[PDB]
Amino acid sequence: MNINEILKKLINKSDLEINEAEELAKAIIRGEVPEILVSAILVALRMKGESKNEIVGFARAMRELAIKIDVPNAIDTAGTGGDGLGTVNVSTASAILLSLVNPVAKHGNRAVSGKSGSADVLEALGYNIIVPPERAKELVNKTNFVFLFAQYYHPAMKNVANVRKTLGIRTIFNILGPLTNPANAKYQLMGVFSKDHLDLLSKSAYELDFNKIILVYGEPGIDEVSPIGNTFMKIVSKRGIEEVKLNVTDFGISPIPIEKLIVNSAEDSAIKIVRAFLGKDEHVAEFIKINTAVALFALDRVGDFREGYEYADHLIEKSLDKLNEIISMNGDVTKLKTIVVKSS
Amino acid sequence: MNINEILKKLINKSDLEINEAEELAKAIIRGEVPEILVSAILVALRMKGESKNEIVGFARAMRELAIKIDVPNAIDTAGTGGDGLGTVNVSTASAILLSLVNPVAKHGNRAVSGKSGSADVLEALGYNIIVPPERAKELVNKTNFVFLFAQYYHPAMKNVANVRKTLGIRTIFNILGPLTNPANAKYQLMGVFSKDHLDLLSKSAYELDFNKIILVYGEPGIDEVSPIGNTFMKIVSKRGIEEVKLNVTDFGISPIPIEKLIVNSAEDSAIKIVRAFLGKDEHVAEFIKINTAVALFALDRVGDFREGYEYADHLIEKSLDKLNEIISMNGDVTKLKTIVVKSS
Numbered sequence: 001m002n003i004n005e006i007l008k009k010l011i012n013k014s015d016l017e018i019n020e021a022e023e024l025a026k027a028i029i030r031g032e033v034p035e036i037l038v039s040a041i042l043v044a045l046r047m048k049g050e051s052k053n054e055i056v057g058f059a060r061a062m063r064e065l066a067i068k069i070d071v072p073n074a075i076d077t078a079g080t081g082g083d084g085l086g087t088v089n090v091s092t093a094s095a096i097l098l099s100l101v102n103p104v105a106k107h108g109n110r111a112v113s114g115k116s117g118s119a120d121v122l123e124a125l126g127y128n129i130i131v132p133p134e135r136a137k138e139l140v141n142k143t144n145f146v147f148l149f150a151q152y153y154h155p156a157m158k159n160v161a162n163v164r165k166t167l168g169i170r171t172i173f174n175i176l177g178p179l180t181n182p183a184n185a186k187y188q189l190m191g192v193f194s195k196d197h198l199d200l201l202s203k204s205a206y207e208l209d210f211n212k213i214i215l216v217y218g219e220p221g222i223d224e225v226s227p228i229g230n231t232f233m234k235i236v237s238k239r240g241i242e243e244v245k246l247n248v249t250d251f252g253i254s255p256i257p258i259e260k261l262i263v264n265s266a267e268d269s270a271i272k273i274v275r276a277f278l279g280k281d282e283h284v285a286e287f288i289k290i291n292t293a294v295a296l297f298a299l300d301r302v303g304d305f306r307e308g309y310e311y312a313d314h315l316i317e318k319s320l321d322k323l324n325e326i327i328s329m330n331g332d333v334t335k336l337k338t339i340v341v342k343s344s
Numbered sequence: 345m346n347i348n349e350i351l352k353k354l355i356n357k358s359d360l361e362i363n364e365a366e367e368l369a370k371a372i373i374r375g376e377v378p379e380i381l382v383s384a385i386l387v388a389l390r391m392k393g394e395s396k397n398e399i400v401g402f403a404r405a406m407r408e409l410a411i412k413i414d415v416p417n418a419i420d421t422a423g424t425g426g427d428g429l430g431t432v433n434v435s436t437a438s439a440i441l442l443s444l445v446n447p448v449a450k451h452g453n454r455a456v457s458g459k460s461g462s463a464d465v466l467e468a469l470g471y472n473i474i475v476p477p478e479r480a481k482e483l484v485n486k487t488n489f490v491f492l493f494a495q496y497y498h499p500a501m502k503n504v505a506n507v508r509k510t511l512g513i514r515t516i517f518n519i520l521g522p523l524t525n526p527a528n529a530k531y532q533l534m535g536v537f538s539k540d541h542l543d544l545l546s547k548s549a550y551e552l553d554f555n556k557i558i559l560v561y562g563e564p565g566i567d568e569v570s571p572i573g574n575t576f577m578k579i580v581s582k583r584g585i586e587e588v589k590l591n592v593t594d595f596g597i598s599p600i601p602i603e604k605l606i607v608n609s610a611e612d613s614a615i616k617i618v619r620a621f622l623g624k625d626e627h628v629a630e631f632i633k634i635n636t637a638v639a640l641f642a643l644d645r646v647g648d649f650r651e652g653y654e655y656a657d658h659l660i661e662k663s664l665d666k667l668n669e670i671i672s673m674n675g676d677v678t679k680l681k682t683i684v685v686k687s688s
């Protein structure tokens with residue numbers, strides 16, 4: 001593994017082989033490459049345009065260097081983020097409904113591009129987002145749910161923190177979070193923030209050994225099932241990649257006004273979700289249900305998305321109680337109660 | 345002038361305005377840009393493909409921060425280098441011939457591309473490559489020749505040294521060398537290692553205020569007048585850019601065996617050069633004269649390249665003596681004679 005040829009090869013706009021990319025990623029994440037070179041590598045990679053092998057190679061590298069736990073049967077709903085609209089944390093919400101019928105290993109981080117990421121809303125609900133691996137396995141067996149905080153499950157990533165911050169631009173690292181579930185979940189719903197990335201990340205995923213991952217991109221440009229119109233998805237599995245185009249009306253619902261799904265803080269998002277669980281906010285609930293519907297389809301619990309949406313309706317009615325039992329076992333339920341009044 | 349804005353601009357592949365580039369180069373060369381961003385900008389600049397305005401901006405910034413001496417009537421023969429063949433230092437040797445007819449202010453540097461760059465071979469002959477400005481003036485008036493060591497006359501350049509070395513790849517600075525002659529020479533034969541750059545650089549030179557400068561790209565793939573076939577060149581003057589193709593036979597000579605023009609060390613190059621001066625190496629001698637011939641055409645001392653090659657035939661005869669005179673005034677003639685002895 002020579003850093004120089006690698007760089008020259010990227011400067012010449014030549015895609016790397018999977019093993020090349022993985023060895024490169026391993027060296028970078030281990031902190032064995034000078035910042036000047038790490039910076040050049042990431043910039044060349046972005047200007048060349050990352051290819052599937054490089055995404056696969058980097059993903060495998062991070063998985064191998066991360067703190068792990070074994071729960072392949074679990075499902076994750078994390079998306080790449082980056083759309084920037086600041087909508088309510090729908091995948092975290094959706095992760096709660098799913099824990100009622102399947103173990104859930106939700107990989108996530110805090111935010112900065114909206115001051116309300118998956119980790120922030122959980123904390124605001126009273127959950128203790130910092131879970132040790134041994135304790136994490138126990139929580140999933142008892143409550144069928146656990147949140148895997150990325151900062152803490154991928155420590156080696158600190159070796160690239162300075163370069164990434166100093167650069168201040170998007171790099172290959174900004175789209176790998178969802179492909180590096182610390183629990184090696186085989187089933188997943190992964191939102192991508194751009195149509196272009198849909199094709200690249202789905203081919204990469206195809207080689208990252210999932211049982212079934214569904215990647216989606218929804219209008220007007222979010223990494224979720226679209227609440228206002230069309231959604232473009234890729235259904236990846238051992239068999240291949242299936243393409244699917246869907247409109248929000250296919251869920252047997254009318255387009256939701258995106259203004260009702262935007263939040264301005266962690267607590268506000270926490271309240272939108274609890275109100276949705278209480279039946280006091282049908283727009284947020286719908287958004288949650290259309291997303292959970294596709295996840296249900298990924299688990300093959302329903303035959304189609306309409307069925308998935310209907311099934312999700314039964315789940316959302318038991319989600320507040322499920323949320324209470326999850327938090328009570330890892331966090332402070334008094335905060336959950338507070339948020340409950342604050343929405344009642 | 346904000347570095348992050350510059351970086352995003354380059355990541356988007358938008359050429360910089362002349363003044364933006366100059367300000368950028370000034371900040372980098374002054375050492376006020378973080379190594380991480382300096383690195384990212386050099387890579388982005390190269391992957392985007394530097395433009396005429398960027399070359400011009402950088403050139404102007406370097407000239408401004410350079411240590412200068414007065415000799416515009418002088419001529420330089422330095423090339424951009426980077427062709428990797430590891431050929432004998434023909435422009436340095438060709439510079440010795442020219443001092444026999446015009447003051448020569450040779451701009452040069454050491455190398456790693458074989459271990460035999462212009463400065464390396466001069467050191468092997470016994471020359472004292474670090475010549476202070478005041479002393480550089482005397483040497484030119486006396487012997488009509490003086491070597492301007494790039495690492496000495498561009499002191500601020502040591503601020504971008506760590507990044508350039510660490511990167512270990514070609515960047516914009518690798519083609520700025522000859523366009524930043526410390527004596528502000530108005531006449532010059534500038535070599536280029538690729539046809540593409542032959543276009544880019546010629547257009548840039550046109551705005552760098554020369555009287556006449558000829559850029560050439562050798563056929564085998566070197567930045568010299570081709571010794572085995574075609575030579576592509578552009579003659580830049582106040583009145584415009586003239587194009588001219590040329591074959592090595594147009595010098596009334598037969599194609600030279602390129603494998604006999606290849607060096608493997610500093611002394612190896614000195615020995616070759618000396619041998620040509622002793623008339624013991626026609627091939628190495630013929631290579632020197634076709635290049636010298638074109639530089640003569642640039643000084644308008646000949647009306648065609650055949651004459652220049654003829655007149656160059658006269659000069660080479662008196663070359664060993666001129667060399668001895670040069671080195672004895674600024675250097676160790678003892679070393680020279682050892683090389684003479686080794687040459688035979």
Ligand SMILES: O=P(O)(O)OC[C@H]1O[C@H](OP(=O)(O)OP(=O)(O)O)[C@H](O)[C@@H]1O
Nearest residue numbers: 078079081087089091092108118191223
């Ligand atoms: O900023 P957004 O419009 O929500 O879109 C970014 C991602 O976040 C959503 O869930 P959640 O809020 O739980 O975030 P996460 O998936 O990034 O953890 C969903 O998973 C999206 O893929």
Ligand SMILES: O=P(O)(O)OC[C@H]1O[C@H](OP(=O)(O)OP(=O)(O)O)[C@H](O)[C@@H]1O
Nearest residue numbers: 422423425433434435436452462535566
């Ligand atoms: O690597 P090359 O095939 O020689 O080509 C690079 C340049 O070097 C040659 O002279 P010299 O060897 O003295 O180098 P310099 O001009 O770069 O100082 C000539 O000036 C070329 O323009």
Ligand SMILES: Nc1ccccc1C(=O)O
Nearest residue numbers: 078107108109150177178
């Ligand atoms: N978007 C994500 C999904 C899962 C884990 C981490 C991230 C992250 O952005 O750091």
Ligand SMILES: Nc1ccccc1C(=O)O
Nearest residue numbers: 150151154157173176177
């Ligand atoms: N940005 C990330 C992507 C993947 C995994 C962890 C991180 C992190 O910041 O900790």
Ligand SMILES: Nc1ccccc1C(=O)O
Nearest residue numbers: 422424451453494521522
């Ligand atoms: N090629 C050159 C020509 C003149 C001065 C410096 C250089 C250099 O490469 O540093």
Ligand SMILES: Nc1ccccc1C(=O)O
Nearest residue numbers: 494495498501517520521
């Ligand atoms: N490579 C160069 C080009 C121009 C001026 C100085 C240098 C230098 O290396 O010091």
Ligand SMILES: [Mg+2]
Nearest residue numbers: 077078079091
């Ligand atoms: Mg998400």
Ligand SMILES: [Mg+2]
Nearest residue numbers: 079090223224
């Ligand atoms: Mg989202």
Ligand SMILES: [Mg+2]
Nearest residue numbers: 421422423435
């Ligand atoms: Mg040269």
Ligand SMILES: [Mg+2]
Nearest residue numbers: 423535567568
């Ligand atoms: Mg040359």
